[PDB]
Amino acid sequence: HHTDPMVSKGEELFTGVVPILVELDGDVNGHKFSVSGEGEGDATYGKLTLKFICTTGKLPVPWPTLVTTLVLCFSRYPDHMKQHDFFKSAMPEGYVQERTIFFKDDGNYKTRAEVKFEGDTLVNRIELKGIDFKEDGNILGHKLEYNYNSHNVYIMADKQKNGIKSNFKIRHNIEDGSVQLADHYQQNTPIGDGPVLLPDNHYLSTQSKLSKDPNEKRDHMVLLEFVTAAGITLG
Numbered sequence: 001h002h003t004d005p006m007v008s009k010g011e012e013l014f015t016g017v018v019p020i021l022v023e024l025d026g027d028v029n030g031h032k033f034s035v036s037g038e039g040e041g042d043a044t045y046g047k048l049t050l051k052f053i054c055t056t057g058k059l060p061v062p063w064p065t066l067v068t069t070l071v072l073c074f075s076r077y078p079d080h081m082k083q084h085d086f087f088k089s090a091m092p093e094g095y096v097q098e099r100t101i102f103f104k105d106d107g108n109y110k111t112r113a114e115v116k117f118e119g120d121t122l123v124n125r126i127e128l129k130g131i132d133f134k135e136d137g138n139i140l141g142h143k144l145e146y147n148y149n150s151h152n153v154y155i156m157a158d159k160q161k162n163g164i165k166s167n168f169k170i171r172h173n174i175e176d177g178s179v180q181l182a183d184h185y186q187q188n189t190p191i192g193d194g195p196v197l198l199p200d201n202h203y204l205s206t207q208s209k210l211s212k213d214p215n216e217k218r219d220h221m222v223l224l225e226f227v228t229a230a231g232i233t234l235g
Contacts, residue, residue, distance in 0.1 A: 002082060006197060010088030013117070014043035014073065020050060021123045022070050028130030029107070029140065031060035037070055039223075041122065043088070046076030046227045054219040061130070062144040063221040064172055067208055068184060069099070069111050071124050075204055075227040080234040084199035086157075086164050086188065092117035093192030095163065101170075104181035107133030116191060138172070138180045145173040148208040152230075157198040163189040164199065203231040 002008050022037030039050030052063075052070055059066075073087035087095065094116025101109040113126040133140050153168040170182040190196050204227050211222040 002079075004083060006089060006195070007082045007085070010085060010091060010197075011082070013091050014041075014088055017042050018074070019121045020048070020071060020074075021118075021121050022050065022052065022126070023124070024066075024070060024126040024128060026061075026126075026128035026130065028061050028109075028128070029133050029135065032056065033060055035059070035066070035070065037124075037223075041071060041074035043074045043076060046074065048074050048223065048225040048227075050223045050225075051213065052221045052223065053216075057219065059219050061139050062142050062146075062172075064144055064146065064148055064210065065101075065103075065109075065139060065182065066128075066221075067148055067210075067223065067225075068101070068170065068182075069109065069113070069126060069128060070223075071115060071122060072097075072188075072204070072227065073115065073122065075229055077229045078234075081202065081229050081232050083197060084202055084229070084232070086197050086199055087115075089195075089197035090188075090190040090192070093190065093194070095188050095190050097186065097188050099184055099186045102183040102185075103133070103137075103139060104183065106137045106139055106180075107131055114191065138174055143175050144180060145175055146210050147173060148210055149173065150205070150207040152203045152205050154201065154203050155199060155229075156201050158187060158189075159198065161187065161189050162196060162198070163187065200232060202229055204228070205230050 024035040037052040172180040
């Protein structure tokens with residue numbers, strides 16, 4: 001029950017708990033790897049629960065560096081901001097999410113993902129290419145703590161592309177107390193030709209907890225993530 005049928009369409013796709021599939025194929029400095037993830041999203045609470053498995057053995061980069069790569073349609077948009085929810089409005093046909101992630105004093109990830117429904121399942125299919133990493137650096141050397149700092153991300157409309165853009169900084173904690181900066185540049189465009197909601201500037205607030213499955217012998221990450229939109233006030 002929103003007065004905007006365009007909003008009603010997206011809210012209906014995401015009521016209740018929605019199953020999620022993630023499939024990633026990566027290549028970082030010639031180390032090829034794959035990751036499969038499964039879980040559930042509950043967009044009413046901006047809540048995601050996912051378990052990822054490296055299906056090619058040991059992950060050649062640290063799990064925290066892949067959190068942002070590995071479904072913003074599950075973000076909680078407050079009622080007064082639902083007319084700005086691009087991610088759900090592009091569903092079910094979906095959207096393309098592209099990033100370049102610059103690791104300060106190290107290499108970069110380039111990622112391309114298609115996020116869309118396959119039946120009732122929300123699917124995130126990703127290709128990742130990483131180049132120019134130091135083989136003894138914080139990434140290829142696995143020197144980052146297994147956690148994730150909370151942060152806020154500014155979202156802007158990209159009118160020319162009928163989508164959105166976002167640039168933001170992730171600070172990964174290094175095992176010695178320092179931080180490893182990951183500068184994200186992001187763009188999202190609809191897969192379909194139909195209309196989407198293009199947003200006013202706002203931000204997404206995110207918190208993530210990383211854990212392990214004590215019964216799991218494959219290299220894996222359990223992820224609990226909350227994402228909530230904010231920065232537009234209800235006067």
